[PDB]
Design a protein around this ligand. Sequence first.
Ligand SMILES: O[C@H](COc1ccc(C2CCCCC2)cc1)CN1CCN(c2ccccn2)CC1
Ligand SMILES: O[C@H](COc1ccc(C2CCCCC2)cc1)CN1CCN(c2ccccn2)CC1
Lengths: 40, 40, 40, 255, 236, 59, 59, 273, 273, 57
Amino acid sequence: INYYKDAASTSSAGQSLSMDPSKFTEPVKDLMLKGAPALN
Amino acid sequence: INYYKDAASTSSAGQSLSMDPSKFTEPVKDLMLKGAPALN
Amino acid sequence: INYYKDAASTSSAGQSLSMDPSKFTEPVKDLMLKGAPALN
Amino acid sequence: GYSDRVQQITLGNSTITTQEAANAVVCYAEWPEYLPDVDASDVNKTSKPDTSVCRFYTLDSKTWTTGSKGWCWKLPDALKDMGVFGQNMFFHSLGRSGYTVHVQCNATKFHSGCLLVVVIPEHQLASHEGGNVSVKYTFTHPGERGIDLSSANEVGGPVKDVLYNMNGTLLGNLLIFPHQFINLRTNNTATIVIPYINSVPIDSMTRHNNVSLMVIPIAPLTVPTGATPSLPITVTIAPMCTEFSGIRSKSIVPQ
Amino acid sequence: GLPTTTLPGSGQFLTTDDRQSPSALPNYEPTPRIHIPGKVHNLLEIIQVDTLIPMNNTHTKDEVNSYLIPLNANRQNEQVFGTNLFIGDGVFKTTLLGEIVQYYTHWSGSLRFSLMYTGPALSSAKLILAYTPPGARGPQDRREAMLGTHVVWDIGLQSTIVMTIPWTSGVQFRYTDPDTYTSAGFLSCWYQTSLILPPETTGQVYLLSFISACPDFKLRLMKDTQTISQTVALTE
Amino acid sequence: GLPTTTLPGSGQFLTTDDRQSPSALPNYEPTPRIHIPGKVHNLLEIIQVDTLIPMNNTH
Amino acid sequence: GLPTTTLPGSGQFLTTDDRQSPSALPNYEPTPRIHIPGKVHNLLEIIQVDTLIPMNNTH
Amino acid sequence: TVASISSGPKHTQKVPILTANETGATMPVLPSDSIETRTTYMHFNGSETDVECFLGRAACVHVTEIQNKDATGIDNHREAKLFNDWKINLSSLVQLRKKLELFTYVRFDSEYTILATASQPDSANYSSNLVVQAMYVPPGAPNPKEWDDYTWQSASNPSVFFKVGDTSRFSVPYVGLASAYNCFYDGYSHDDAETQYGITVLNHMGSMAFRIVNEHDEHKTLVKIRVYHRAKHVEAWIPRAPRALPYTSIGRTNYPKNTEPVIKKRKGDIKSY
Amino acid sequence: TVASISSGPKHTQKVPILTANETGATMPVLPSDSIETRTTYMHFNGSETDVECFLGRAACVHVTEIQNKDATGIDNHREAKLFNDWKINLSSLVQLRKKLELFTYVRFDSEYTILATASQPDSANYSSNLVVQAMYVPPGAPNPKEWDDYTWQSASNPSVFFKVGDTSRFSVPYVGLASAYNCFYDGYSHDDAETQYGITVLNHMGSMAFRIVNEHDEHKTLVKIRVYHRAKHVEAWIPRAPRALPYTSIGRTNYPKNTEPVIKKRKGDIKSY
Amino acid sequence: TVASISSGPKHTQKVPILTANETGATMPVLPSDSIETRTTYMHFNGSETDVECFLGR
Ligand SMILES: O[C@H](COc1ccc(C2CCCCC2)cc1)CN1CCN(c2ccccn2)CC1
Ligand SMILES: O[C@H](COc1ccc(C2CCCCC2)cc1)CN1CCN(c2ccccn2)CC1
């Protein structure tokens, strides 16, 4: 129950439960498959 | 939920969301169209 | 009504109403019947 | 017979071929794109010179020697004088751009050495004076020359200490930024595609640089016996999806 | 008027509680969000990116050189480096992994340790990396080392080798601050055959080493880091 | 009696908060509204009317 | 603002009361339970196991 | 539920009262196996002997004390009780300890209540109103060194601020590293020849730091902190023999030497009533 | 969810453990790519590492102090701490600062908690009860000049009145001018040759003024204000390397000269354990 | 809501920017009547300028 009118006044947000490290761990242009050779 | 009986005791009103500047910006008797000459 | 998000914050648990002393009072491998001889 | 290894990038009227690449990085897995209306604020129609600004400019070459500490360029600064890209830059109030960065360094199978090529969004430098000394404008706008981390402290300039990234963080952790290594034994180029990253939809190109490109020797250069002890490093960079807005009189900037 | 009773704890301020508050700026409209590449949602997303380990810690002032593990041509049987696995201390401590682990009290999971070789292309080498699970001493010679988790690495075209320290543990969580009961083992590396340089070449070659966490990893019970402190408030 | 806990901020007066209050004048009937030309609803309505700028500030 | 009245006993701490409290460690995940033989639920379960009586108390 | 059924005379070949205790069982013999009984009902459920109930009331687990005074020229705040810590345990005070050690492994959520009262043992014009600050400095986090260190910023560490005279209260999930807390541990932290034995090694949970936030007034004020602990969501495994001798140390089973006979000697014979 | 799958011996042409780090990727290698594993489940979600959780607890961001005393003959209230302001920032105290600067741009709502305690360092008959007044004087609004100026009327500016010893609390929407707050800014406010660099230019949010509403009693009373800040509704972009050296200034990245080596030197060889 | 619509070159007999202020009106002229604009949205309602808000603290 929100007792207040504005959105800033609500409690903390709830877990992204998004999670996708590939923008950080695999930003390569041509896709690399694990097990296939790195450099062909 | 109002806890009180009288109307003065309720919280602030809620946004007019009315908004019509023409009583102030265009109080002319004969309607002016933008693009048409001001004085004919 | 829980007012809080985490489970640790809820009140005491509610009675097991489990109760089974046999793991402590009769942990014998071959079942003993009351009334039958203890050692055959 | 496609290898990760050979590549061609054609952009505008200019083409680059590498026969010894190590894939390419696209920052944060996003490719440069123009500014959508839903994200727009300034009401001005923007100008998109296209092929006259989105081509490859090769900056002047550096020389890696056994004593090198590393070099740092800022964008869009490094290009402030390249062809029509630069003119547009000084002439509009606001502009926006992504880039393809291609760093080149070839040697032979007897050399060793490994450079880190990294792009740091919003690289705010530190004053070597400490306290709250600022880093004057000119010092953070070296132009095509870039900053040479093995040059001496100057007054009003930034600190040039490599184990600290010019800001109080350790060299070792720069790997959290989009980056690629050039290991003479593997690699001969590094290519990074940079999407436009800012907290506003379009900004000024002269008062704010939005990425520093940094090339840092990490495993020292080691040449074969009686080889000349140095290799040149060349940086070629191409603006991509550039847009300029708010045209007028032509900015005048310090120094 | 509805009858109430207040409980113990009334009026306290707990920095970790999460409740509603009146907005000081009623009706204000925040700036629209625009798109920015790079959004982070979990610290677990970022500790999977690998970063360099200053393994060569033997210097006396911080230098680029403590990231370089040296290799000697023609040595046989010998040991390249050694370290315990207290990820919250020692070599690990300044790495991004080490640096985040320090915001939490407990960790569990597998680690990924990789080595990238930087020697001339015409050289060759075979190294063995060994993980020694808790309970034995840091190995003293390869024979000892090779009886635990190990990978023979053959230096080739493929420049890096990724060793995993699989989670070997009785207790399902360990402390990030070094603790005995909770200790994780040792990591050592030895020549399997030996580094060989081509003609016209000389000196030391170096390995770069990285650390990142497997997708396996768990961190819990947040706390304050020993890695930052201060004596007076800063000002502008 | 229902159990409660009071939070930080209890008893504060924030000039910008908006809540209910008891009426001091229970049951009073205000004067009827009559029509008056000119009602303003938003300050945004009025800043669109132009006014003169003392541009020649040099006095 | 809803009108309330506090009763006698407000603010007391009764060691035997059972209510909710804020968690100091929001969002923390406890270690999984594994199976352990021997769980006790009631003290009534254990007082049915017999134990020896020092009947010869005379020492 | 019947507590006793009706049962009458017996002349059988089936004797439920003869058993062999050597087997380790306690055969479930009832009054009706050996006398003639009448029906009676239980009227009772055994509610208040549930382990949740047994361990579920607040017990005092710790009393400490800190003072508010001018720290000017104090070389060791910790030592002046300018602030204080508690190498958190539940086996310092013994009423609750004997209760928990009836079990080998125990798992539960805790609800803490902290009462703080002030004393002004020497001449003061008044009673000041002090706010207490309690911080959790886990294993590896910075420990406060002065009563006003950067540590107290507690940007990542849960802390509660309440007033002396009042009480503070919150609850913590089960923070043990294993599946249960060991009430006992017959092991070491490693195979060292001189390492310590017990649970002292296992039960590593950090300290809870207390301080007054107020600067000093002209008089000195003693604030004494009492921490109460209530187990909620209790789970207990493997019952053990109750503690008979007195305790000597947190975390070891050791009893004092030349202790006294714990079994009451008869005033009379074995035959005495 | 499985944390590890079962995997057995391998003798392949498909080697997942050989990679080329020069590419910039961290290949997702697992224990089961290089040893034989058994199935195990995660039993965990990664809840407490969510950025909302990481930045979502209150941190102390500012400690200031004001006093209640006779202003008679004071030529500069501001200077007598008759009232005080804070050129609002979140980068003064460093515990929270290092946490935020793990990201480049950050966007969130703030929830402030303000604790005020009083001190009476020299002889008073009693402790008075003071009410604190805190006002937000945005960029362009009148700044208080005396402790009782027309400014304090605060007819258009949000202000909260609470009692010393108590706490005040409210929450503010994200008030940044852009889409996110810049944790870093490699720019200037204009192309000036001598203008300041950093964020000091961007992060222009005004000051929060505090004063006591009470007139003076016969003694003097020191009131010390602590502002706590909690981020709610957090959004963070572009992770960066953590801060290694100490901080010297609000808003610049500058570190102190002749700082000490931040990497611990081995006591022994590279080969040492 | 659009804050500005897209508008391009103009060469007309219809001039919205010439008016006669003597009339007492403020003619509703927009950026797009005199420069070439691109579409942009308002993203804003004018909530905090409502007179209830202005006089309500
Ligand atoms: O109740 C304790 C919780 O540990 C904390 C964690 C955080 C805090 C902080 C939270 C924020 C507010 C300040 C206190 C205090 C104690 C754990 N407690 C440790 C001792 N333990 C046992 C178990 C068996 C034998 C002996 N002790 C029982 C369980
Ligand atoms: O939390 C601050 C809100 O600003 C206000 C606005 C109003 C008030 C008033 C409201 C009425 C009650 C008194 C306080 C106080 C602070 C904004 N805060 C500014 C600093 N900011 C950052 C971001 C990146 C780097 C450094 N700081 C984080 C966000």
